[PDB]
Write a protein that binds this ligand. Structure first.
Ligand SMILES: Cc1cc2nc3c(=O)[nH]c(=O)nc-3n(C[C@H](O)[C@H](O)[C@H](O)COP(=O)(O)OP(=O)(O)OC[C@H]3O[C@@H](n4cnc5c(N)ncnc54)[C@H](O)[C@@H]3O)c2cc1C
Ligand SMILES: Cc1cc2nc3c(=O)[nH]c(=O)nc-3n(C[C@H](O)[C@H](O)[C@H](O)COP(=O)(O)OP(=O)(O)OC[C@H]3O[C@@H](n4cnc5c(N)ncnc54)[C@H](O)[C@@H]3O)c2cc1C
Ligand SMILES: NC(=O)c1ccc[n+]([C@@H]2O[C@H](COP(=O)([O-])OP(=O)(O)OC[C@H]3O[C@@H](n4cnc5c(N)ncnc54)[C@H](OP(=O)(O)O)[C@@H]3O)[C@@H](O)[C@H]2O)c1
Ligand SMILES: NC(=O)c1ccc[n+]([C@@H]2O[C@H](COP(=O)([O-])OP(=O)(O)OC[C@H]3O[C@@H](n4cnc5c(N)ncnc54)[C@H](OP(=O)(O)O)[C@@H]3O)[C@@H](O)[C@H]2O)c1
Lengths: 448, 449
């Protein structure tokens, strides 16, 4: 069959790009092997946030609630009810996505696709061809090459757990490790986080990882630093012992690898299309998402860019705008992309860290504003939690180049401040907006 | 007679902020407060109100959402005395740090009701004190209806002194405080009733907000009674009160809260002697720079009839001390586009014009509205799903954003940044060019279609 545009992968980039293109008169087909929505709807963003919410509820009941007057008994935590509720929600999401593509006249082909040549793909026996092909195949979890690695599960295995384990070890030191560790500890399991060096999120502003370690030390997960995994030993009773290179070891009932992800560009026969990947397996793309072959583009996690659903969506829309809506210089700007980590407490960050700004502009040009305070929600309890916020400003005008914060509210408050950052806000612009009281967000417009 | 360079009457929000900024620049100051430092905000407003909103968030987490996330929970006892004790200890620690800052700033705090003897002289506790500049930041107080039985009702100060949570509560009113108190008492488990005189509460807010707020009320409390004009409150033999309404309906409850407005506390300080003019409602009349008609007397805050928010008092007070004492002759607060959050259920966030106001002011042909409605994710996996509804109001070819309105979980915290953007003159294009943050409720304003 012949289509004007085919996207391989019904994850964030594929779906976004094919719907914008179907809007401009194009005949499109989306191909997906597993479920619509990709990592984000199925084993990523949506199910992670439901599980963050379950943890926040258990913490209100068990940690904070007592000091607010509530003497409560959790009679039963039914893991089955929670997973049946998250699954029903995701099934409603699948049906919505189906309806949108249907409205758009996109032909959805369920099956695994592989290249025959630069303009042809084989899917379920059938051959389909198109003048433009988007590869948006995403990624998959990495696993250390050590003895016993197959005893651990990864973040996809986390979403399939039949019950909450008593003792869990999470290995890794980036976003996924920090969030899964935080959720699982929040839901009651004895939780350990093993990181290789001094702290998790070592690339984030120093304030953020220094504060996360503080919270961890007060309320869990138990953090272990300088921890290089050597081997996992399954024991007689069925538990696992993670052995570390320095001699330390820990026995758990479950071990989750959260050590990075890797592109899923391999069994699709790129060689036949002539598309080049780099040393790490990512499809190499330019500014405009073009591969080296004319007529083939890539967006998303499979290109090595920052792995976030909104980046994949925005690059994918702009791509269909360039191609099918005659906007030749249209493309995504990958700087000042806002991030929120759903840790305990949430992290919100956009723009440069203070080390980055002091390297790029020099100490003499950088002015930093910091605020540290107890989140009000916790201030009336014996489990008080810091909130810490930082503005990084450059030049006499104190143009704002990075906004960082960690504490309750960082999740919802960051977006509007990113718009502001994008417009070129200065300290004065923040300062001349009237605060909203009582909120945490108002601390960014009243820093002194 | 001691003479000061600056004296504030009122140690609430405008008074503490203006006096501290003045002391920073070398002025010898005195703050006069008749009751407790921090005023309405710290003691019977902002701070205890949010502590009580969090306690409602917690009971609703245990009782309403918890079950569908699999937590089978039993509240063995809800101890009101513990909650009130933690709330009070937090307000005492706040009194202590204000005294700490005023003390570092060498401000003389005098405790007592002050009254003007003439334009430059004040009497407080038998002593006469004089100053070159005087700030009147006296605030306001609850208004009460003029109907038989009014004294059986309490108001918002009384709500913060309740010795226990009543089983049946009536809240009468349709503003911020009635919507807040009524959703808190309802969230805390009491059979709650809201009585409004016309068709909906918050009738001055964008219609989408009052419309959605009624939807939620009908689905999960408080029980809302529209077209309700109070006629009388009967104290009954068994202790309960019966609110009777003009059209004949009545309701028996154990506690009734008047939340019908506030009025300025400008009347007992002998303004006549100083010569200060007030308006027909009793507010002190001020210009753009917080000046009264008497040279060297200024007022900020709720006693001026400007929008009654703690940050507006604080910002006008701080900027007034910049103008008088730090050489910025044109320093003044711009009262437009001031952001508000109502801590209702769900929160409301709003800034700029409503859709009716933008269509009146710019004409229908110039106004473009974007809307978005979804279920809040926290609730979408439960059998108690709540809407989130968001609106952007734009004008002209450029689609300059003149209003941002929303009601839904996350509106309390997400609004501050967007208000900085509106202030900067953002258009829809600028919102659309920022990369969303997923999964949040906030991202909806940058992906609106
Ligand atoms: C645990 C976890 C948490 C995350 N949380 C967040 C978060 O809260 N916020 C955030 O912004 N980001 C989050 N992310 C990242 C986010 O999920 C990704 O950045 C995003 O999904 C990338 O979109 P994509 O289109 O590149 O790939 P994906 O969504 O991974 O989609 C790729 C799709 O292609 C399909 N496919 C692959 N090859 C073929 C083929 N040859 N034929 C047919 N079908 C094929 C796959 O089945 C899959 O559905 C998270 C990731 C993980 C794993
Ligand atoms: C229930 C409730 C909830 C609220 N919630 C919020 C909210 O969340 N966010 C928000 O921004 N706003 C809120 N507000 C409004 C806010 O509290 C007021 O806008 C704010 O406190 C006004 O500050 P002010 O300095 O004008 O006066 P006030 O805080 O009222 O203080 C004036 C002070 O003057 C003192 N006084 C009066 N006359 C004299 C005298 N002659 N001599 C000496 N002392 C005197 C009084 O004792 C008082 O301490 C709320 C109000 C209420 C009642
Ligand atoms: N809410 C969100 O925005 C969100 C949430 C989750 C994921 N995502 C995205 O998905 C991307 C990939 O996720 P990820 O967190 O798995 O990868 P990641 O961010 O690259 O973090 C993995 C980290 O684990 C450590 N590590 C690597 N090998 C290790 C090993 N052998 N043993 C122990 N530790 C090892 C490294 O840190 P050290 O060098 O310090 O050891 C590495 O930086 C993220 O970068 C993010 O963009 C987004
Ligand atoms: N979010 C915040 O920052 C916050 C929170 C709380 C309070 N505050 C401030 O404090 C101020 C005062 O709040 P408020 O709620 O007390 O007053 P309000 O906002 O003026 O609202 C009271 C409403 O009560 C109704 N009403 C008046 N007389 C009535 C009567 N006799 N019987 C029944 N209903 C009657 C009127 O609405 P109808 O005409 O529709 O009946 C009136 O608009 C607010 O304006 C606000 O600025 C701020």
């Amino acid at each position: 069959k012949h289509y004007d545009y085919i996207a391989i992968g019904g994850g964030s980039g594929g779906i976004a790009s094919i719907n914008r293109a179907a809007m401009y008169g194009q005949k499109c087909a989306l191909i997906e092997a597993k479920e619509l929505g990709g990592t984000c709807v199925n084993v990523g963003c949506v199910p992670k946030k439901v599980m963050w919410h379950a943890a926040q509820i258990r913490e209100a009941i068990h940690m904070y609630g007592p000091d607010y007057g509530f003497d409560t008994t959790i009679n039963k935590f039914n893991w089955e009810t929670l997973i049946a509720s998250r699954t029903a929600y995701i099934d409603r999401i699948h049906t919505s996505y189906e309806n949108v593509l249907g409205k758009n006249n996109v032909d959805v082909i369920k099956g695994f696709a592989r290249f025959v040549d630069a303009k042809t793909l084989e899917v379920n026996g059938e051959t389909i061809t198109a003048d433009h092909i988007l590869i948006a195949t995403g990624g998959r979890p990495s696993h250390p090459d050590i003895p016993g690695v197959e005893y651990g599960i990864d973040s996809d295995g986390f979403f399939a757990l039949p019950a909450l384990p008593e003792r869990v070890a999470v290995v890794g030191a980036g976003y996924i490790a920090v969030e899964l560790a935080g959720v699982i500890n929040g839901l009651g399991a004895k939780t350990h986080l093993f990181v290789r060096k001094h702290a998790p999120l070592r690339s984030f502003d120093p304030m953020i990882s220094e504060t996360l370690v503080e919270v961890m030390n007060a309320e869990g997960p138990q953090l272990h630093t300088n921890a290089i995994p050597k081997a996992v030993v399954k024991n007689t009773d069925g538990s696992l012992t993670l052995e570390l290179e320095d001699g330390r070891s820990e026995t758990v009932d479950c071990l989750i690898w959260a050590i990075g992800r890797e592109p899923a560009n391999d069994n699709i026969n790129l060689e036949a299309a002539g598309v080049k990947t780099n040393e790490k397996g990512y499809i190499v793309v330019d500014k405009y998402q073009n591969t080296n072959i004319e007529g083939i583009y890539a967006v998303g996690d499979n290109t090595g860019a920052v792995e976030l659903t909104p980046v994949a969506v925005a690059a994918g829309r702009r791509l269909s705008e360039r191609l099918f809506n005659n906007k030749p210089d249209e493309h995504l700007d990958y700087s000042n992309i806002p991030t929120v980590v759903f840790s305990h407490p949430p992290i919100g960050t956009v723009g440069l860290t203070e080390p980055q700004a002091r390297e790029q502009y020099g100490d003499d040009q950088v002015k930093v504003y910091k605020s540290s305070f107890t989140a009000m929600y916790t201030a009336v309890t014996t489990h008080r939690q810091p909130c810490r916020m930082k503005l990084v400003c450059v030049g006499s005008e104190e143009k704002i180049v990075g906004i960082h914060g960690i504490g309750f509210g960082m999740d919802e408050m960051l977006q509007g401040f990113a718009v502001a950052l994008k417009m070129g806000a200065t300290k004065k612009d923040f300062d001349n907006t009237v605060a909203i009281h009582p909120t945490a967000a108002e601390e960014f417009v009243t820093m002194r």
